[PDB]
Design a protein around this ligand. Structure first.
Ligand code: OM3
Ligand code: OM3
Lengths: 149, 149
């Protein structure tokens, strides 16, 4: 559970926002890319796993599950690559709700940046710092620290 | 000190590697950029502060210290921007040592990636996971968790 992350891809402004959610905390990392390719997804996972102890990734679609570049990055970084099949039906809804929340925040900051990627990072900042009581950023740190000890 | 980060800029292959070091842990984030500008530095700090509770940044040089875009990002993200003067002289050496270690790792993985940015992220991963004992990634989590609690 401390090491489990979920990939999520959403669209805005004719661009792609790639998101990794730390399932237990709701903490996120995200990036803007022109389109979701295996190489982009692989690179994003390499970045993520250098930053947090990523043990398992539930991929966002079967193309990234299949992608040999994504598999090579998971091998490199010591990540177990799994499917994202929502055997729990509430998984679909949680991700949907997050995409809607993120897009709403992006709208609230959109005028404060020229480039979409800036607004997305502002949205990541707000999402991770929002107290719900602890923030997602606080919850991820506590979960992993508990796990280390 | 859980909140204190130091910016560091180094060169390789005609490109710039921008590094943020969490001083208390030695944990790092890094990116490759064509050249160090106020705008790239501002964007890097925005990304960083969405991911970790950044209270203070010691900037790497007087141009990023002066930069109005860097100041606007520090304002946006709630970061106190400070100068990077090594009033403690052992600070110069620690960063120089880190740049040489990072470059060493980058050369050990350089053949495993076409693009420099990939090699740099592999080096970030290795650096943060290296046990010296605890790794830098373990230390940063423990430090911040203790601070929340
Ligand atoms: C396309 N190449 C192939 C390659 C080319 C040359 C040497 C080795 C390999 C190779 O397969 N290395 C194993 C891997 C190790 C970790 C992750 C993925 C693969 C890797 C790659 C993937 C994604 C990217 C890249 C790059 C890049 O080459 O820089 O740059 C930005 O997003
Ligand atoms: C240069 N612009 C000016 C701007 C343009 C339009 C609206 C507001 C502003 C504005 O100054 N907002 C205040 C901030 C300034 C810095 C950080 C947070 C808020 C911002 C910026 C900085 C660095 C970047 C960017 C961008 C971008 O516009 O996307 O893109 C990649 O690295």
């Amino acid at each position: 559970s401390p090491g489990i992350w979920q990939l999520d891809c959403t669209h805005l402004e004719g661009k792609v926002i790639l998101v990794a959610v730390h399932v237990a905390s709701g903490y996120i990392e995200a990036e803007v890319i022109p389109a979701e390719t295996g190489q982009e997804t692989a690179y994003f996972l390499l970045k993520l796993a250098g930053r947090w102890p990523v043990k398992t990734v539930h991929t966002d679609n079967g193309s990234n599950f299949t992608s040999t570049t994504v598999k090579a990055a998971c091998w490199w970084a010591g990540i177990k690559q799994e499917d994202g099949i929502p055997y729990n039906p509430q998984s679909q809804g949680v991700i949907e709700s997050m995409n809607k929340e993120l897009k709403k925040i992006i709208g609230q900051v959109r005028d404060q940046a020229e480039h979409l990627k800036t607004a997305v990072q502002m949205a990541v900042f707000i999402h991770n710092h929002k107290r719900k009581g602890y923030s997602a950023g606080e919850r991820i740190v506590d979960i992993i620290a508990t796990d280390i000890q």
